[model samples]
Target: APREAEAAALLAATVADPWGLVAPSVYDTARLVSLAPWLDGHRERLGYLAKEQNQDGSWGAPDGYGLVPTLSAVEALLTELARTDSGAPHLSPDDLAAACADGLGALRDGLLAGPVPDTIGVEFVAPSLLADINTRLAALTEQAPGKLGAWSGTTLTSPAPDLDGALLAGVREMTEQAPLPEKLWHTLEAVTRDGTRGARPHEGAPPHNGSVGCSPAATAAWLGAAPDPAAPGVAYLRDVQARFGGPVPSITPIVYFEQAWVLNSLAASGLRYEAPAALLDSLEAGLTDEGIAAAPGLPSDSDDTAAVLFALAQHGRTHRPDSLMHFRRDGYFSCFGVERTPSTSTNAHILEALGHHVTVRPDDAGRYGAEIRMISDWLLDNQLPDGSWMDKWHASPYYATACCALALAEFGGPSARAAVDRAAAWALATQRADGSWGRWQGTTEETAYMVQLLMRTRTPGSPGTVARSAARGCDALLAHDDPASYPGLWHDKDIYAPVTVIRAARLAALALGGA
Candidate 1:
């Protein structure tokens, strides 16, 4: 429990920094690379790209995760080489060309990697990066003629899977329909023409200094063509570069989302009353009519918003779950009005928040009670045939499955038991030889999710094989050396792992049987 206490303390401290180092983001790095012309810190960012390349000549994770970063990095290196003719004196043109070729092969390998991971803005990022790399490859080949080959492409084809194509098409519709104050700031540069019109912030608007969703690239998108150095977006980027010493996280200066998830993870390990009074108050205060966003300035959505409510509810406080009411659809809730697919994890958080609110205030029985049942049913229906669930917000099914299972176990009552049991069974059946659960190779994040599943699916006083799997999973989690290898499972332009947040969650999982 000392470590648990330490985990809580570390998470609490994130609030002090306010914008937590959410995590290193391949997608964001790509954005920073793409934005080099407008920004002043190319050398520092070039170092980021140089350092992140894997031996396989790719970047990112979950198999072909390298595709997006590789594409962006190559384009950036090509840009540098184009300017200097030989590329950076520090970065050899030959090495960059070889890496570019490796990137193309990795691109092909990534195309067949697996099903959609449901990362943040792959619809935009995948397509945009494809277009950018292909275009730049053409230019790169022109400069190096014969040396670059088609990898330096006269024209390179997109190896991106079909879903990316569909998402870009779908995005146009939603963008045209939703109002201006939507979630586009996160992927501001990626929206369709109509969505660009809708979500574009004021012209010359600088990103809020150290603000979330105020990424250098995203804010520049918000600022549109011909940004001014004096504008807020430029100021914001300068502040970020200065703060992090030249690298920006996927979400810079991340706010409450860190504490929101961290506290919940500790409590889930049965550390309920550990939340300090002031911290609870701070989280509660952060909720707005829109609810706290995953990060400051990003359009508020259900996950972190509902999570804040859920965390507070566990601490014997019940703010109105009404903060999340707008997203409630006929069957289930969407992340926001713009979301094409209803997120399994979003509803999972809403269900728990509603259940907790009702538990504390029996008077809330009318709508809150109904919402719990409604979302629970929706979750049951969406459960994959394999008894797992896929969420558009994150990469792995383990995350979606774990969130739904926890909600059903806590609020689904006798009827929902079957669904939870089936999901848990799916988990046990699919448990890795290493005792972890992951869509890709085994990961501690996915394994932590499985541990939660095992805990929930087991009946009281009825020992089961679930325990054995849980033990192995516990082992897998504690033994993993590179926790960072968890991949960018979270959604963003690419994927963002929310390092401190999940680290807290994993800490709690490890303590389930005492790590």
Candidate 2:
């Protein structure tokens, strides 16, 4: 089928960009605390910051999405300026300088715009980034004696002074704490003071992988470029660089997450069934007692495991939801161990996976019924006052809203019927005149979510509104080119789109045609 062919080509291209892993991320690239000894790569990372910056001087979403990465990238840019001043040329010091200025300006306006947009760990990351930016910006000023020119200002944001002391203390405690919170590892740079960090690669690393908390920036931050080129972290960094050339993803090789989401998104359209045999085997093979990692050698996470469960089931394979059962809370599901904010999107996926489980094994319905009801009720209870859901994993209400909407629509039973209709109505009410949806503007990614909802949920003789909106939504998706730039929605060290994964979501939406 044409659908299968197009999907294979798209999937092939998804993992083929550079290294078949996480797309090049500005936030991830910016978090490279040290570029020394490997100075050759600094130029590439700096160029990325320049390339991704917004015309308005911010670096991310229409709202808070820009703040977090803008802070990280600006700090990196200032450090790059410092490096340039130290005789380490970054291709073009003047260009890097201009980008640095623009970043600071936008970051200032954003903090002034409102409370810095809430992020996964913004309470810690935001204040810590502000501290680093202040220190780095000052050092750059003192070193150059006003060479920063227009970029220089007193504008910066921070937490209350009482919270500031706790952050540094928390940083030290977390640094010394055994079993570093896996989620904290992504934003590890936010915790440790530059040059003050002494944790070795082995101190914070997983047993088998060459990663520290499965993060390149975390790995590099723990191991310097000097004295120990053979340090475990250095080897990992170099290996990733072999793929990224210079700048890198916030995380690398998100094969499990990418494949799972890609296949699931495409499959959601009910238009394709052929999966690469290798891809299917790898998905099955990658599982351990702990379940699948977001990628190879990373910690097993409920989010990815649940996603894979749904994907595998969708692909005509039966999978146990037991891997996800490990994350069960007293009444709700946590993303992973040691506690994270419960995610509606995550729970929604769990619900879908469980729904698939009962579908294949009809006799076991009673065993899952109670738990399923609990999650469905939990998801509905967590809905926003506006009938949308915001997720800790993503920056967009539409994304969270979409994930919850689709899952509830598919499996939430009669109790959820009204809620699902409300969700659809919310989409219809909020849609812009351009026939697209987003947190703040028309974006292909969110538009696809709307289309997917509109088209996939329709039934025989159902109202025409769903079909009409979806058709217009398809037009919106076609208006964009393939491999469109996406809003920074998914959370990590900073927010980033799984470029190829989102491409698949968009393509799948468009594949639904005119509904």
Candidate 3:
């Protein structure tokens, strides 16, 4: 129970500042203090965090952060707001609320404006943001529902388990605030409760919750969150764990997000802490106190370092003296390291890790500050006139724009603020009347991402055009409740498309305030 509570608290804390690595400005002294109780004794360590947050309330790596960290920080901050009551003078709730509203407005404006070009990279088109926007728009189905189905564009797809888990998680979260439609809830509940066994009639298709290999983690998550452990869902978890024993199957490709989510589920489910011991060991083995093993045989990477650090910290392993060196040096603390490589995704992960560390281990602030500055500078220096960014991982400019905007908020200065504002202007300029923005035309994933980004930056009640666009996009997503069906199968010629799409949808739902 202690470990479960601890893990939940850690997740909550990390999510509180989802965009803190790039835009901690929205958070105030009160917000940090509110997180104190969940942080246990890490309050003092977080004291200097407000000082480190960028003036515009954004932060990022040398090369700029990505959407993942921004989302994580936003979620964490929202959780903190939900749980805390520290609204003091310097940490006035009204003031903090206003800042957050502004940030969200800016994001919405940027999404509509479209992409821009720069020396570091070009802010081309993005499908992920468009997908996200559509998801958000679909949410308004109750008012003016339309075709509720999966998206169909690029055939690329990854396993469905991750996406299923994310969707279920989002559903679980939303259930607390508002009950989902019966059909949706039942579908998710059935898969989560049954471990995909007999849940899906079709064969060859991956299990909705996850494959049997990783079912234990999925089952664990369901059981941990379910109101009744004795429920069929809980039983499913026990059965899976019993069968797998310790050290479940690895997700392969060594991604920290997958590992962390699965590990967190295991921890939450009362599985043996050693259930992921082997996986942890493998991750630890990849490190050399310099950085993480980059792409298998390459040198180290700052992105990997941040992910490793976040994973290790979640496991309560931050005190290791040797590991501290990785966070030192200029751009060292930045997401993806001091090199300022062109990977926004890696930068986002690093920012998440650094934000977590800054909250829990203030003594290490000196080590992370320089890197944050370097990454932030890189992001500011690289902004395109149209206010968007590009990425090799996904084919969408909105995705990059979301990531870049969050990074600017985290670490941008006056100049950085100007760049972000320009990006926001671009987003505002480009949003389609249909409330979606995407590249390769449009997809559910890109739409969802863009909507989330804009929501984070938009002013709550301001008649800002961006806010209106974001609202429309949110409506589109809600309209299509069945992302799996509407998006259809995202698997491209590659075998990984299914898995990738599922994760993207789940994450996109989280951004849209969907369970």
Leading candidate by TM-score: 2
Clashing pairs in 2: none
Model 2's lDDT to the true fold? 0.70
RMSD of 2: 3.7
TM-score of each: 0.85, 0.87, 0.41
Worst 10 residues of 2 by lDDT: 199-208
Residue lDDT tens for model 2, 155-187:
575443422546655666756646445656655
Better of 1 and 3 by TM-score: 1
Summed backbone clashes in each candidate are 10, 0, 128
Off by over 4 Å in 2: 11-21, 33-39, 84-98, 105-113, 137-165, 177-179, 193-209, 230-232, 235-245
Model 1 has an lDDT value of 0.68
User: Per-candidate RMSD vs. true structure?
Assistant: 4.2, 3.7, 22.1
Whole-model lDDT values for every prediction = 0.68, 0.70, 0.40
